[PDB]
Amino acid sequence: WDYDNNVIRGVNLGGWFVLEPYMTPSLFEPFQNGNDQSGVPVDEYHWTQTLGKEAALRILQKHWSTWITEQDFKQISNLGLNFVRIPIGYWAFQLLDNDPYVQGQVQYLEKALGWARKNNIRVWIDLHGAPGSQNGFDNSGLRDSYNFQNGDNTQVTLNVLNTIFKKYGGNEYSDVVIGIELLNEPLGPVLNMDKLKQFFLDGYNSLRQTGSVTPVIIHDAFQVFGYWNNFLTVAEGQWNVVVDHHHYQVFSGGELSRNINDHISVACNWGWDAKKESHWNVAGSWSAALTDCAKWLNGVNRGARYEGAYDNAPYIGSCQPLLDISQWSDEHKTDTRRYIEAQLDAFEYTGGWVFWSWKTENAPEWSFQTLTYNGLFPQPVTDRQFPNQCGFH
């Protein structure tokens, strides 16, 4: 890959090797008791623990073998995409004592790399969950815990990274793997940033020490634009480094309350600010969502800010009419199309974009397939119904 001259146009293969309740609610809904959600496991940790090892493995084998297949890769290529990001948890490689997780993801990851190769798709492997959790999000595997930097959890994470480095950072996959992402979304504000930098540095050095020339992807840890400009630099002999920025406008009351024009202005500004940074950078996660209405987006047994039901947000509108794309008003379809196009322009202004996610069971704002089939995501992806909203030059 040429990060100077190529543009990434990709999708995340989320919900596959790390369960996220909002993406596959059918796996969590049987634990509901009527309208009571208090007994629903909140994350993959508690889901596997509640089921036990035998049942968890039986259900996950069926999920892993059907959620994404070779057909999906063919469709991704046919839609003009050139890239996938693949989240995987640490537990696919190593279990802590008393971890409830089951293994077997690796066999499917390796199938996926072969499917990528056959369909001319390039890949980042992304370590999405670290022991103890790096952010307390359910997508780390373990919700509401922040112990990545406590005990030996950082050392275990580095050991898991070494395994990934040796298996997928070498000559065997040099034609497919164009990045190994050390850690998805470490929650900067609650972590020690000096220790997080040391971790990134140790991972960078360990990778290069194996003889690998694979790009190292670091997530921005929710820091301001430009924060990482002076870290892992050419002047210090550190090379092939990419910054992964994630971008949404739905996870606070203030962001949700913006009118469509202000949503677009913010999206354009992501492009202008990313252009100023000194590292190659890619928008590795973003979506079409203008609400947080998708069931369990904020977590199992949590409601939506959009309808004033979480995070002390004021009511903006009812979520029920927005849950099905066939009930969307013409205005909401138009707003969505404008928002998507503005983000695409901003992200192609630097390294490119990776939409979250390829598919969901029934959450249309977060499904590349559903948006494409309904004509809301540009196809071909260069098509514009609202050209030049940002005025880049």
Give the three-class secondary structure for 122.
Answer: strand
Nearest alpha-carbon partner for 274 in 348, 184, 187, 196? 348
Render 236-276 in DSSP notation, one character per residue.
GT--SEEEEEEE-S-SSHHHHTS-HHHHHHHHHHHHHHHHT
| Tokens at 315, concatenated | 């009511």
The CATH class of the 1-393 domain is: alpha beta
How many whole angstroms separate alpha carbon 204 and alpha carbon 239?
9
For 199, list phi and psi in degrees, rounded to 5: -60, -45
- Show the beta-strand stretches assigned E in the chain: 8-12, 83-89, 122-129, 177-181, 216-219, 241-247, 280-286, 352-355
| Tokens at 388, concatenated | 């030049």
Q: Choosing from 20, 44, 181, 295, which is the catalytic residue?
A: 295
Question: Cβ(243)–Cβ(227) under 8 Å?
Answer: no
Question: Cβ(202)–Cβ(265) under 8 Å?
Answer: no
Question: Cβ(220)–Cβ(286) under 8 Å?
Answer: no
How many whole angstroms separate alpha carbon 297 and alpha carbon 363?
9
Give the three-class secondary structure for 281.
Answer: strand
Q: What share of the chain is helix, strand, coil (3-state, %, to 5)?
A: 40, 15, 50
Question: Cβ(220)–Cβ(227) under 8 Å?
Answer: yes
Nearest alpha-carbon partner for 105 in 120, 127, 76? 127
The experimental technique used to determine this model is X-ray
Give the three-class secondary structure for 329.
Answer: coil
In the chain, where are the structural domains located? 1-393
How many whole angstroms separate alpha carbon 160 and alpha carbon 131?
10
Q: Is 185 considered catalytic here?
A: yes
Q: Which residues sit opposite 354 in a β-bridge?
A: 10
Q: Choosing from 20, 44, 181, 185, which is the catalytic residue?
A: 185
Render 341-392 in DSSP notation, one character per residue.
HHHHHHHHTTTEEEES-S--SS-GGG-HHHHHHTT-S-SSTT--SSTTSS--
The residue type found at 362 is N
How many whole angstroms separate alpha carbon 135 and alpha carbon 153?
13
Q: Is 29 considered catalytic here?
A: no
Q: Which residues sit opposite 33 in a β-bridge?
A: 36
| Tokens at 109, concatenated | 């990851």
How many whole angstroms separate alpha carbon 173 and alpha carbon 170?
6
CA dist 239 to 75, 197, 213, 234, 275, Å? 34, 16, 9, 6, 19
How many whole angstroms separate alpha carbon 53 and alpha carbon 61?
12
Q: What DSSP character marks residue 131?
A: T
Question: Cβ(148)–Cβ(186) under 8 Å?
Answer: yes
